[PDB]
Design a protein around this ligand. Structure first.
Ligand SMILES: [Fe+3]
Ligand SMILES: [Mg+2]
Ligand SMILES: [Mg+2]
Ligand SMILES: [Mg+2]
Lengths: 212, 196
């Protein structure tokens, strides 16, 4: 999903709000902040109601303005709430009644997702791959800066996981794939307009193809 | 372009808790147990321990760099958001830095939950494109003879940086070395500092 969450490479932001080793304060800066993650795990591990991938995607589904003005932990309150309503566990009425006011949710999905790719390649360390030049309206774990670009394999994972583009929509056909550490030269991604060296993206097999 | 009307976030978060808890869906003590894990167990002290061991034990270093999951498991530090671990080695010509441009993904058990700045739009947007300038602004100058490599945490690999061991620490104990490996050293935005 080409949403505003896909921030890598966006220009115009100011300074990162940190200097190295500065005091970051406590783990939680308000007494509710442990709730989003805790309740995500309740949903995943205790209820079986959704995957972590579905949490990533429902946060991507926040209305874009809403996403941009919402603090991090609040986005996950909104996202977990949204999934609980979509899955029929909770109602928005009861959320708003308990909250004493409005509790707008993420927007409905506008994709049903896609299956794990039928045809993929097992790549080796040192091999050159291209990120498939595809557009996925639903969830995908491919930042757009690498779409269509060329890089080389630095690692193939020794474990496999469900394809995000399927399990992030709660589908039954996510299968399993390894992922690959794909190293891109900075210039491959941003031309002359970068001060970096290389970027390594951890890409599912189904996002990749052999280079030319 | 206005913000939507919203109840206070604290009210919304506790409404979500209460809605679920009142339906019997949240075990006794569940969220309080997670809070304790997040606060007390998941910690960059663990990654610092691992770095110090690597610095003082060539065999362990090799293991950490080749099978980070196995190395971490020896210490019992695998966990949520930290099940498949890769450690990345800084060298005299290479500085590694970690981000999650899409969200916030972090090796929780060994780095701790991410700090606010790591989850900022500024860091997420900028470090993949201009890491040298970002690190400079944050207080870390990377000499121009060093390639910067940014790892974007886009799948299930969870990373830690193995920084170079600074001069002036020869013969230090594991405890002494751990003290100088900070959270920011593990993320990759800082280099371990040795006092004057
Ligand atoms: Fe993330
Ligand atoms: Mg985009
Ligand atoms: Mg853009
Ligand atoms: Mg030495």
């Amino acid at each position: 999903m080409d949403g505003v969450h896909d921030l890598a490479g966006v220009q115009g932001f100011g300074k990162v709000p940190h200097t190295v080793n500065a005091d970051i304060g406590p783990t939680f800066h308000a007494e509710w902040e442990h709730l989003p993650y805790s309740l995500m795990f309740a949903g995943v591990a205790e209820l079986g109601a959704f995957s972590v991938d579905e949490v990533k995607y429902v946060v991507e589904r926040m209305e874009p303005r809403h996403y941009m003005m919402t603090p991090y932990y609040e986005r996950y309150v909104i996202g977990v709430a949204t999934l609980m309503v979509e899955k029929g566990i909770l109602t928005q009425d009861e959320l708003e009644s308990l909250a004493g006011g409005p509790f707008p949710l993420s927007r409905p999905s506008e994709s049903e997702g896609r299956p794990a790719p039928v045809e993929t390649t097992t790549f080796e360390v040192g091999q050159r791959v291209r990120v498939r030049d595809e557009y996925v309206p639903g969830h995908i774990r491919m930042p757009a800066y690498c779409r269509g670009r060329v890089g080389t394999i630095s690692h193939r994972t020794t474990e496999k996981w469900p394809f995000p583009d399927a399990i992030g929509h709660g589908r039954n056909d996510a299968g399993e794939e390894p992922t690959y550490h794909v190293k891109f030269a900075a210039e491959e991604l941003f031309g002359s307009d970068t001060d970096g060296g290389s970027v390594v993206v951890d890409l599912f097999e189904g996002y990749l193809e052999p280079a030319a | 372009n206005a913000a939507p009307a919203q109840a206070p976030v604290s009210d919304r978060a506790w409404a979500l808790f209460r809605a679920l808890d009142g339906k019997g869906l949240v075990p006794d003590g569940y969220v309080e147990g997670w809070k304790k894990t997040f606060e007390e167990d998941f910690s960059p002290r663990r990654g610092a321990e691992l770095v110090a061991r690597a610095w003082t034990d060539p065999e362990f270093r090799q293991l950490l760099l080749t099978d980070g999951t196995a190395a971490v498991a020896q210490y019992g530090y695998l966990g949520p958001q930290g099940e498949y671990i890769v450690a990345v080695e800084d060298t005299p010509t290479l500085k590694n830095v970690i981000v999650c441009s899409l969200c916030s993904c972090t090796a929780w058990p060994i780095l701790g939950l991410p700090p606010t700045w790591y989850k900022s739009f500024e860091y997420r947007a900028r470090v993949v494109r201009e890491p040298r300038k970002v690190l400079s602004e944050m207080g870390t100058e990377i000499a121009s003879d060093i390639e910067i490599r940014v790892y974007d945490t886009t799948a299930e690999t969870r990373y830690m940086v193995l920084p170079q061991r600074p001069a002036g620490t020869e013969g230090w104990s594991q405890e002494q070395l751990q003290e100088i490996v900070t959270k920011d050293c593990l993320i990759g935005v800082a280099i371990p500092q040795v006092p004057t």
